[PDB]
Enzyme design. Structure first.
Site, PDB file in Angstrom:
ATOM      1  N   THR I   1      -5.207  27.653  33.011  1.00  0.00           N
ATOM      2  CA  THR I   1      -3.957  26.886  33.290  1.00  0.00           C
ATOM      3  C   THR I   1      -3.476  27.148  34.711  1.00  0.00           C
ATOM      4  O   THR I   1      -3.374  28.298  35.136  1.00  0.00           O
ATOM      5  CB  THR I   1      -2.826  27.257  32.309  1.00  0.00           C
ATOM      6  OG1 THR I   1      -3.216  26.923  30.970  1.00  0.00           O
ATOM      7  CG2 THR I   1      -1.528  26.517  32.660  1.00  0.00           C
ATOM      8  N   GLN I   2      -3.192  26.072  35.441  1.00  0.00           N
ATOM      9  CA  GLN I   2      -2.626  26.173  36.778  1.00  0.00           C
ATOM     10  C   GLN I   2      -1.584  25.076  36.973  1.00  0.00           C
ATOM     11  O   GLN I   2      -1.150  24.433  36.016  1.00  0.00           O
ATOM     12  CB  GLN I   2      -3.708  26.054  37.870  1.00  0.00           C
ATOM     13  CG  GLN I   2      -5.148  26.281  37.435  1.00  0.00           C
ATOM     14  CD  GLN I   2      -5.770  25.027  36.852  1.00  0.00           C
ATOM     15  OE1 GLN I   2      -5.157  24.348  36.027  1.00  0.00           O
ATOM     16  NE2 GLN I   2      -6.985  24.703  37.292  1.00  0.00           N
ATOM     17  N   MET I 107      -9.302  25.724  28.647  1.00  0.00           N
ATOM     18  CA  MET I 107      -7.912  25.859  29.104  1.00  0.00           C
ATOM     19  C   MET I 107      -7.813  26.131  30.610  1.00  0.00           C
ATOM     20  O   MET I 107      -6.915  26.838  31.073  1.00  0.00           O
ATOM     21  CB  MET I 107      -7.175  26.940  28.298  1.00  0.00           C
ATOM     22  CG  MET I 107      -7.040  26.613  26.819  1.00  0.00           C
ATOM     23  SD  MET I 107      -6.009  25.163  26.520  1.00  0.00           S
ATOM     24  CE  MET I 107      -4.385  25.832  26.886  1.00  0.00           C
TER      25      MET I 107
END
Ligand SMILES: *[B]([O])([O])[C]([C][C]([C])[C])[N]C(=O)[C]([C]C1=[C][C]=[C][C]=[C]1)[N]C(=O)C1=[C]N=[C][C]=N1
Ligand SMILES: [Mg+2]
Ligand SMILES: [Mg+2]
Ligand SMILES: [Mg+2]
Lengths: 222, 240, 235, 212, 244, 231, 204, 195, 233
Positions: I1-2, I107
């Site tokens: 996730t970013q 993810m």
């Protein structure tokens, strides 16, 4: 935070006849209040006289169908080109879905075809692989609009015979393929009117002993 | 890890490492098993080359695997401890998961499976041990007696012997054991077991061990004097 | 010394060829396939009279529709049987159906060449796998430690195999009944066995579509032995 | 969901409802909440549909392998413990199960084990499980005896599910009856609640509160 | 490849013997003799150091007698370096047991553990076995005073009196002759030293060529004391028993 | 001699004997023929039985809708290699939506077999393969050797007595390459080719195995009464 | 919730003339509930004494761990471990669990057998050494103990005077802490005699 | 589960454990035995999170039974309690700890003394004349503090236990459906079938 | 996730009778800061495919390197790399779609929306969309971000269904695309005047136009607009 899931809308419908089965679905693909495509096929011929649709999050839907089609291919390789029966396909799909129990395919899966006695068969799955053979099942966005109508018009629920006043039920007479297609078209026309994610086009795959046939119908585009 | 295939086939279709493990069993002290009508007796030879031994603490030849099953052996003593430990662990694991103690056949099948595994696994040699496994299944009064060997084959026996000079005591048992009428009592069964060892043992002093197993976890090891009374009575009948 | 997976100058794997010699020393097992069922029979060959012969288990159930007989180093067969049973049950779990006899046999044969420097040597046992499925009917397969399996109308393995196979060559036809097959296995077992054949040193079994795999009682086999003796004395 | 099982003179009665819900939406009225593990073993289904289906079908595979290996029928104790030990491995991961494992062996007699996704394993005579479990308990506890005929026992199980079907919103559809003897279970039909309610009301004199 | 150079340390001979175990026992037969004698009121451990020098620092030296815990000690015969590997493992095992159960480890359980480690090197791994034989002298409240021995095969046995290393055949015959069951520690001390004095390959038995230890309940009231004898104390007991 | 104990050892003349011994296993195997035109590619295989009670060992394996092979030598090794091809064909389709080129399939088989000829512990594959296929560049025929050598050909044969069929195809080269849009005639040429390798035995209904792939023809195997037409 | 104040308890150590003293309460509780009045928090390995406050399971675990380590030390070194060396061992052992620590407040007390010098030391839960000349305190009433010690203490007290000082420091500190008390023990330590005294105190 | 009590008298240890099993809204069972025999003269009662309690108890039972067979000897209550404590102390820093509290009642045949050990899920062990887990002590300790004398007979211990259970039945909100009482002495373990 | 840092806005495209057109502006935004003014977001692959990318620019550059490597890899041991075994638009898309869905499943997505425009070997038009979720779809017109809301309605007036494609010329299609880019410049606050446009035709091949500008803008009417209601001056 990254959300790995999305909702592509759409609605699907499977109905099992006496010696046939239909699997229908609208061709509209959406996100939020936008239309991605007015014609994006959702119901697929997977071989061995089996049709399949995995409705909900389209990325998971495509992934599942792709892995099942693959499973049919390898079933032929591993078991001397034996035909994958609908009940065996159904159990196989349960394991594909339950394999990702803790990170589920966000879809409502329906397959249709003929059982080993040549009778019409429809199977229905939840996102984590629970399944059940059914005579009638709608899936997706407008499923709550369509199912009650099918309870009434396919299974004659709450219908009784005139003159008896509730004593004698309306007998469950078998429906022809022409009759089923009428109910499918009216189901989607009605769903299109009252559900914003349903529209554009309706594609029906009909399964018989002769094979898989396709029918397409226009739906309202608003 | 050390992966070398030690147990392999030879041109004549023999696995020499397994066959040489049987030669280690042939060297081991004699062990005998006899099942009566309502009991099983396990007899074991103690070589009298070792005196000044402390018999209280020295590892006994018959080992309880559970309260209802026992295991004796012939061959390498150190090897037998590894099989006994594994068997004891499996017995408790079975009780834990199945909520029932092992059958004698099940325990035998496990020990035999371990022995077989060591004949086609890389980097290991076979066990130089043959075992006699005896006891009674839970809530059952039928006597059980099984044998295993380094190759991993196992089978049930009315009476059997293993170890050095086992050919001689098997000869005795084959002519003295009647299947239609097995030793009806504990006395008769112990007597026949002591008699069979006296064909091979030497002195009937501290060279013979006897363990009696009866139904419902009733296991007892006879003392020197109790065995000595059998030894005395046998030879006094023989003087005729 | 030399590799376990080494080829001979003739293009054969040394270890596989040597395991075939161990199978020749094994007790005889015979299978006959008919349109009414497949019969499996084995020589028990007890090493001593004190050995309780009913504990000798050389015929084994894999599933309700598949049985198996063995010959050679029979201890090696246990992990093969365990794999077969697991494969049969696992397929039923994944596909809600019976597994094909050929597919089961292929799964067992996939273990065969998994040896090297995986297990340290090939299996020293041959299997006769008999069963029924809806697609190919009654079937009999011969699974070897080479990883090869042949389908057979009739087959004998073990020490009396080439003498038995020559006898099966003459006797088998496509119209054999189940009863005729039972007697035929008993007849040929009696021919190649060292000791005199009876219900305690020989065992019969069969697989039918209706009843599935069944190991015969000693009382049932004893009658078939008596029936055999009388029909041979009949001419 | 309302499922029950109880021990008596004639063996075990198993009775379950047929309804499945997603929130207030009735997803299905034709769910098979009893699983046929073999001809002798039954499992009931409550909580997550999939979890119960998958792992009790799996349980049947383990039972078959046991009796292939051990040449003997698996005990209800051993069968229930395979399932409880399995779900205990997954404890925390979020499985959702409340099940009764029902069978009848020589050594045990009629036996019921309540198995649970938090790892609970309980042997007992009467169990009710599900959203409508309290409603069914009432009818059972006041009418249960050991000396019930197979006929009367079957009716009590049917009547107890009906009580729950009436009052519990997440229970209904139809009733599936099973009777478990030592030679195996015996199916005793699907009974629509829509027809069963009006029938029982008329014949029994109960539900005077409802107009018909 | 590498197979060419593999000695295969864990194989049977055609006679059913383990080559490396047999050869390790041959190695041990050249090591200094160690003797253990069990009495009713204690145990004696006596051992001969191998051909020493006058420049060896004896009072800080230890090659034969080692402490495993306060209740158990061992006499070593064979490769000293191999023995220290096993000794350190045994010391840890004793402490693991004490931590787990809050009781001192029973003698046999410790012995069985070390013997199982030895056994492993004869069955798997492809490594050479430990060229060591131990005499275990110990006490616990179950069996009281106990003597055990273990050898490279991993086989162990219990004894009233026993010897390992060089001239065990001669030593064991002498012990078997003079040992009695009602014997006491002071008598056992004399027997051990007399036996070494007759079996030794040296010209005479002196204090600088010996290691000596006793395990006595000769500790004030119901408890056990280990005594590793100092060079001067070995010299005194040699005079007392009338050997020098 | 002293240099044939394992695959990791060159001989003094630079030969790999274990690989050569693996090559020998192919020569003991039953004959199989491959040939192609510009529209179709055909495999013909003589199946071998154990005895009169036994079945005839299958020789042809399907890899994809557009590709498959025939084997000669150790059958289990063909199963391993064909399984690998099935996976590679499948990876191409799933990831790239692309049917695997027959030439690239040959390159993958070459590299897989090579690793078994340079490392200790392993062994070379003991089987030869004839791969046919129809891709974007038309019909193809490959010959695989477990040395790692793969070769694209118009026609060939491997197995016992394969030299007779190979000479026939070398004569007929100009004729059979022109058999376009006529599957039956191309198979006839293959059946006539494999006949040059027969001795004592002839082509029967359960002896003969034929496979074909082409422009509008998925890889299909013919056995039993389906090949009686060509006998 | 706070692991260091679930069970409660205190330890205090003091140096005197040719002597050291270490003392502790006897309470073990489950928050408000008093469970045991015989939970001694002072242990000894040879002549080196170790008091441990904090989470009771870790008190027990560390005692067993240091017994383990000081027993091996003695077998290898052929001598008893000294206070200075043991202090470093405690520190090393605590810091190895830097990011999953034992929730404890150890206190070392003893006299070096060779130099005869009195020695005390304290630690936080992860190993930091506090080597004070005068006194060390630990536990749920450490604030109270600091107050008592800082006023009552004077250097070079004789063993029997030091006893009175440390006892009054403990007792009055414990009585101002809900989770401390239920009895007390005081160790007076000299170079070759150690006296242990149980104190009479209020049992609420 | 809920209430587990223990009292060590002159010549025996008495353990009392509730019979109720409650899943949320319903009492599923009223005859549950919350105890396991670890050895002929050692009994362990237990309470905590569902599933974990029985899983832990049976795991300990299996380990002690294994020791007994291996050595042909019964471990002392002290030794068993130390083994159990270590397992819980190991567990508390695991990925998913055992949420189980136990009482161990044993008769030491060597010392001829009854012994009661209280151990919580953290691995906190104490030897006590009487003990409890959860809220049970909150009611009973005042009665036990008053009436307990270390030289009581088994019958006097049972009477004092009845007074404790009566207080619990009066002041506790939850219906724990009575208790199963078991006595551990020189002759082994037995259950009081009328309480 | 970013989270996306440097981003590119809309990519728009449509089919016409003989091929496909695709376009995207040359801006790399840093939040509300219009940081980089010379960023090419249309990346050609061979002479038959153009991949248009919106969203995170660091992830775009990574994808650009994957495509460059794909061309290199396809040429290996491939005598027909510039003929029958050249990369097709469908191959390139399926590869990207596989990567996108795999990355979302770990993810750790590539924070992009991608349109693959091209012409197949048989002359068929290829136009398909894929994004950070692995979601894919095809349509006669496709657009990302703001383009989906504003460009699609305009482009759909030219090609409303499949049967309108053969009736649409390259001049009409390009005109519609250019107009849509003007509309996006009026109304998208993260757009620029400068853009690139690519045409892939089955007859004339790949035409790549750089340094195009939005022109013919209406602003004159702004002079008459005063205040927010009542103000007259
Ligand atoms: B029952 O209510 O537990 C019922 C039985 C199920 C095992 C077939 N469960 C459900 O209906 C659950 C929701 C629920 C309701 C009440 C209590 C607990 C759970 N529904 C589902 O699992 C479900 C819903 N829609 C599709 C598939 N599965
Ligand atoms: Mg609409
Ligand atoms: Mg309801
Ligand atoms: Mg207070």
């Amino acid at each position: 935070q990254f959300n790995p899931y999305g909702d592509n809308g759409g609605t699907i419908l499977g109905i099992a006849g006496e010696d046939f089965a239909v699997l229908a679905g609208d061709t509209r693909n959406i996100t939020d209040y936008s239309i991605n495509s007015r014609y994006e096929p959702k119901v697929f011929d997977c071989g061995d006289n089996i049709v399949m649709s995995a409705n909900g999050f389209a990325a998971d839907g495509d992934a599942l169908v792709k892995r099942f089609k693959n499973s049919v291919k390898w079933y032929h390789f591993d078991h001397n080109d034996k035909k994958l029966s609908i009940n065996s396909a159904a159990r196989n799909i349960q394991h594909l879905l339950y394999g990702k129990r803790f990170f589920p395919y966000y879809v409502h899966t329906i397959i249709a075809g003929l059982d080993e006695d040549g009778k019409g068969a429809v199977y229905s799955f939840d996102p984590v692989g629970s399944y059940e053979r059914e005579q009638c099942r709608a899936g997706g966005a407008a499923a709550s609009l369509i199912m009650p109508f099918l309870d009434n018009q396919v299974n004659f629920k709450n219908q009784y015979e005139p003159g008896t006043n509730g004593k004698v039920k309306k007998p469950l007479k078998y429906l022809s393929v022409e009759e089923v297609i009428k109910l499918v078209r009216d189901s989607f026309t009605s769903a299109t009117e009252r559900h914003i994610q349903v529209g554009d086009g309706l594609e029906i795959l009909i399964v018989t002993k002769d094979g898989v046939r396709k029918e397409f119908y226009e739906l309202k585009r608003d | 890890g050390y992966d070398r295939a030690l147990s392999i086939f030879s041109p004549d279709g023999h696995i020499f490492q397994v066959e040489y493990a049987l030669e280690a069993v042939k060297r081991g002290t004699c062990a005998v098993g006899v099942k009566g009508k309502n009991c099983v007796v396990l007899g074991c030879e103690r070589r009298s080359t070792l005196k000044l031994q402390d018999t209280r603490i020295t590892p006994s030849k018959v080992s309880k695997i559970d309260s209802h099953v026992v295991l004796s052996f012939s061959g390498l003593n150190a090897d037998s401890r590894i099989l006994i430990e594994k068997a004891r662990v499996e017995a408790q694991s079975h009780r834990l998961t199945l909520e029932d103690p092992v059958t004698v056949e099940y325990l035998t099948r496990y020990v035999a499976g371990v022995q077989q595994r060591y004949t086609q696994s890389g980097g290991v040699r076979p066990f130089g041990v043959s075992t006699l496994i005896a006891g009674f299944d839970p809530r059952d009064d039928e006597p059980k007696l099984y044998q295993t060997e380094p190759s991993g084959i196992y089978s049930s026996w009315s009476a059997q012997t293993i170890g050095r000079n086992s050919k001689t005591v098997r000869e005795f048992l084959e002519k003295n054991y009647d299947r239609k009428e097995p030793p009806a009592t504990v006395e008769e069964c112990v007597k026949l077991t002591v008699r069979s060892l006296l064909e091979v043992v030497q002195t009937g002093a501290k060279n013979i061990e006897i363990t009696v197993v009866k139904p419902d976890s009733d296991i007892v090891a006879l003392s020197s004097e109790e065995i000595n009374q059998y030894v005395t009575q046998i030879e006094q009948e023989k003087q005729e | 010394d030399r590799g376990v997976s080494t080829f001979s100058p003739e293009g054969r794997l040394f270890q596989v060829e040597y395991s075939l010699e161990a199978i020749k020393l094994g007790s005889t097992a015979i299978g006959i396939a008919t349109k009414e069922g497949v019969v499996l029979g084995v020589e028990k060959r007890a090493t001593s009279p004190l050995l309780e012969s009913d504990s000798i288990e050389k015929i084994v159930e894999i599933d309700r529709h598949i049985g198996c007989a063995m010959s050679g180093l029979t201890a090696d067969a246990r992990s093969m049987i365990e794999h077969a049973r697991t494969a049969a049950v696992t397929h039923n779990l994944y596909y809600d159906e019976d597994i094909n006899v050929e597919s089961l046999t292929q799964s067992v044969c996939d273990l065969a060449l998994r040896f090297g420097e995986l297990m340290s040597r090939p299996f020293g046992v041959a299997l006769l796998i008999a069963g029924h499925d809806a697609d190919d009917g009654y079937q009999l397969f011969h699974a070897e430690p080479s990883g090869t399996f042949y389908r057979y109308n009739a087959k004998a393995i073990g020490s009396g195999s080439e003498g038995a196979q020559a006898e099966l060559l003459n006797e088998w036809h496509s119209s054999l009944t189940l009863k005729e097959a039972e007697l035929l296995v008993l007849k040929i077992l009696k021919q190649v066995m060292e000791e005199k054949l009876d219900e305690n040193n020989a065992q019969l079994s069969c697989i039918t579509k209706q009843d599935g795999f069944k190991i015969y009682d000693n009382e049932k086999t004893a009658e078939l032995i008596k029936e055999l003796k009388e029909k041979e004395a009949a001419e | 969901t309302t499922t029950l099982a109880f021990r008596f003179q004639g063996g075990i009665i198993v009775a379950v409802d047929s309804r499945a819900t997603a929130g207030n939406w009735v997803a299905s009225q034709t769910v098979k909440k009893v699983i046929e593990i073999n001809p002798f073993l039954l499992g009931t289904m409550a909580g997550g549909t999939a979890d119960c289906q998958f792992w009790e079908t799996w349980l049947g595979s383990q039972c078959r392998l046991h009796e292939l290996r051990e040449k003997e029928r698996i005990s209800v104790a051993a069968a229930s413990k395979i399932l409880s030990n399995l779900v205990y491995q997954y404890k925390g991961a979020g499985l959702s199960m409340g099940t009764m494992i029902c069978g009848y062996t020589r050594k045990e007699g009629p036996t019921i084990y309540y198995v649970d996704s938090d790892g609970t394993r309980l042997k007992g005579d009467i169990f009710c499980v599900g959203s409508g479990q309290t409603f069914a308990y009432g009818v059972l506890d006041s009418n249960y005896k050991w000396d019930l005929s197979v006929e009367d026992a079957l009716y009590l199980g049917k009547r107890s599910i009906l009580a729950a079907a009436h009052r519990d919103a997440y229970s209904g559809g139809s009733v599936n009856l099973y009777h478990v003897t030592e030679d195996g279970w015996i199916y005793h039909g699907n009974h629509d609640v829509g027809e069963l309610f009006w029938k029982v009301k008329e014949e029994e004199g109960s539900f005077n509160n409802v107009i018909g | 490849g590498s197979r060419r150079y593999d000695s295969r340390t864990t194989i049977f001979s055609p006679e059913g013997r383990l080559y490396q175990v047999e050869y390790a026992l041959e190695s041990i037969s050249h090591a200094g003799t160690a003797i253990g004698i069990m009495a009713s009121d204690g145990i004696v451990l006596a051992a001969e150091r191998k051909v020493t020098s006058t420049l060896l620092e004896q009072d800080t030296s230890t090659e034969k007698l080692y402490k495993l815990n306060d209740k158990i000690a061992v006499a070593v015969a064979g490769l000293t370096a191999d023995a220290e590997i096993l000794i350190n493992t045994a010391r840890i095992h004793a402490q693991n047991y004490l931590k787990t159960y809050n009781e001192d480890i029973p003698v046999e359980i410790l012995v069985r553990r070390l013997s199982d480690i030895k056994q492993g090197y004869t069955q798997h791994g492809g490594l050479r076995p430990f060229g060591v034989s131990f005499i275990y002298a110990g006490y616990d409240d179950r069996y009281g005073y106990q003597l055990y021995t273990s050898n490279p095969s991993g086989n162990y046995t219990g004894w009233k009196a026993i010897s390992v290393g060089a001239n065990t055949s001669a030593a064991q015959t002498l012990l078997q002759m003079d040992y009695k069951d009602d014997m006491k520690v002071d008598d056992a001390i004399e027997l051990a030293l007399k036996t070494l004095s007759k079996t030794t390959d040296s010209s005479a038995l002196t204090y600088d060529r010996l290691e000596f230890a006793t395990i006595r309940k000769g500790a004030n009231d119901g408890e056990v004391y280990q005594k590793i004898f100092k060079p001067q104390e070995i010299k005194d007991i040699l005079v007392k028993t009338g050997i020098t | 001699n002293n240099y044939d104990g394992d695959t990791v050892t060159f001989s003094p003349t630079g030969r790999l004997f274990q690989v050569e011994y693996a090559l020998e296993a192919i020569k003991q195997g039953s004959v199989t023929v491959g040939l192609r035109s510009n529209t179709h590619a055909v495999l013909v295989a003589l199946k071998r039985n154990a005895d009169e009670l036994s079945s005839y060992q299958k020789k042809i394996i399907k890899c994809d809708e557009h590709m498959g092979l025939s084997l000669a030598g150790l059958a289990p090794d063909a199963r391993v290699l064909s399984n690998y091809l099935r996976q590679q064909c499948n990876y191409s389709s799933l990831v790239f939506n692309r049917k695997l080129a027959v030439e690239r399939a040959g390159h993958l088989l070459c590299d897989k077999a090579q690793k078994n000829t340079q490392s200790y512990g392993g062994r070379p594959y003991g089987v030869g393969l004839l791969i046919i296929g129809y891709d974007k560049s038309g019909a193809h025929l490959l010959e695989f050797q477990p040395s790692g050598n793969v070769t694209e050909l118009y026609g060939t044969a491997i197995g016992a007595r394969s030299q007779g069929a190979k000479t026939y195809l070398e004569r007929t080269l100009d004729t059979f390459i022109k058999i376009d849009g006529n599957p039956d005639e191309l198979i006839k040429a293959g059946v006539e080719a494999i006949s040059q390798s027969l001795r004592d035995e002839s082509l029967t209904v359960d002896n003969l195995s034929i496979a074909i792939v082409g422009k509008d023809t998925p890889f299909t195997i013919y056995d039993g009464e389906a090949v009686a037409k060509y006998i | 919730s706070d692991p260091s104040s679930i069970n409660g308890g205190i330890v205090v150590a003091m140096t005197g003339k040719d002597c050291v003293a270490i003392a502790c309460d006897l309470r073990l509780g489950s928050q408000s509930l008093g469970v045991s009045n015989k939970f001694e928090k002072i242990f000894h390995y040879g002549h080196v004494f170790l008091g441990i406050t904090g989470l009771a399971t870790d008190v027990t675990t560390l005692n067993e761990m240091f017994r383990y380590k000081t027993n091996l030390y003695k077998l290898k070194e052929e001598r008893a471990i000294e206070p200075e060396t043991f202090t470093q061992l405690v520190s090393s052992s605590l810091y190895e669990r830097r990011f999953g620590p034992y929730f404890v407040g150890p206190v070392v007390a003893g006299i070096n057998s060779k130099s005869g010098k009195p020695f005390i030391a304290g630690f936080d839960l992860i190993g930091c050494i506090d080597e004070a000349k005068d006194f060390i305190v630990s536990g749920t009433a450490s604030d109270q103990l600091f107050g008592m010690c800082e006023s009552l203490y004077e250097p070079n007290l004789e063993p029997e005077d030091l006893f009175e000082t440390i006892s009054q420091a403990l007792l009055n500190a414990a009585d101002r802490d809900a989770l401390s008390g239920w009895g007390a023990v005081v160790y007076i330590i000299k170079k070759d005699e150690v006296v242990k005294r149980y104190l009479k105190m209020r049992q609420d | 589960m809920d209430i587990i009590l223990g009292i060590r008298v002159q010549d025996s240890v008495i353990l009392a454990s509730s019979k109720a099993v409650t899943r949320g809204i319903s009492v599923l069972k009223d005859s549950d035995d919350k105890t396991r025999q670890l050895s002929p003269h050692t009994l362990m009662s237990f309470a905590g999170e569902a599933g974990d309690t029985v899983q832990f108890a049976e795991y300990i039972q299996a380990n002690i039974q294994l020791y007994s067979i291996r050595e042909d000897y019964e471990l002392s209550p002290q030794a068993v309690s130390s083994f159990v404590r270590q397992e819980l102390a190991k567990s508390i820093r695991s990925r998913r700890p055992y949420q189980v509290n136990v009482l161990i009642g044993g008769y030491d045949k060597k010392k001829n003394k009854p012994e009661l050990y209280q151990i919580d899920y953290l691995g906190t062990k104490v030897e006590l004349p009487y003990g409890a887990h959860g809220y049970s002590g909150f009611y009973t300790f005042s009665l036990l503090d008053h009436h307990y004398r270390p030289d009581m007979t088994t019958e006097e211990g049972l009477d004092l236990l009845k007074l404790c259970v009566q207080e619990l039945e009066k002041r506790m909100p939850m219906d724990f459906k009575g208790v199963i009482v078991k006595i551990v002495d020189k002759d082994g373990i037995r259950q009081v079938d009328d309480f | 996730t970013q989270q996306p840092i440097v981003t590119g806005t809309s990519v728009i495209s449509m089919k016409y009778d003989n091929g496909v057109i695709i376009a995207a502006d040359n801006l790399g935004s840093y939040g509300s800061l219009l940081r980089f003014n010379g960023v090419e977001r249309l990346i050609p692959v061979g002479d038959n495919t153009v991949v248009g990318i919106s969203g995170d620019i660091s992830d775009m550059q990574h994808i650009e390197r994957l495509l460059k490597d794909l061309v290199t890899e396809n040429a290996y041991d491939n005598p027909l790399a510039d003929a029958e075994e050249a990369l097709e638009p469908s191959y390139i898309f399926e590869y990207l779609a596989t990567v996108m869905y795999q990355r979302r499943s770990k993810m750790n997505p590539l924070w992009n929306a991608i349109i693959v425009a091209g012409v197949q070997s048989n002359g068929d038009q290829f136009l398909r969309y894929v994004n950070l979720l692995g979601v894919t779809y095809s349509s006669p017109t496709l657009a990302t971000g703001f383009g989906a809301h504003m460009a699609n309605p305009l482009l759909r007036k030219v090609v409303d269904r499949e049967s309108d494609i053969p009736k649409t010329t390259v001049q009409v299609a390009e005109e519609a695309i250019v107009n849509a880019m003007r509309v996006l410049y009026y109304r998208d606050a993260r757009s620029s005047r400068n853009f690139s446009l690519a045409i892939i035709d089955k007859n004339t091949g790949l035409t790549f136009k750089k340094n195009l500008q939005v022109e013919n803008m209406k602003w004159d009417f702004a002079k008459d607009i005063k205040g927010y209601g009542t103000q007259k001056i």
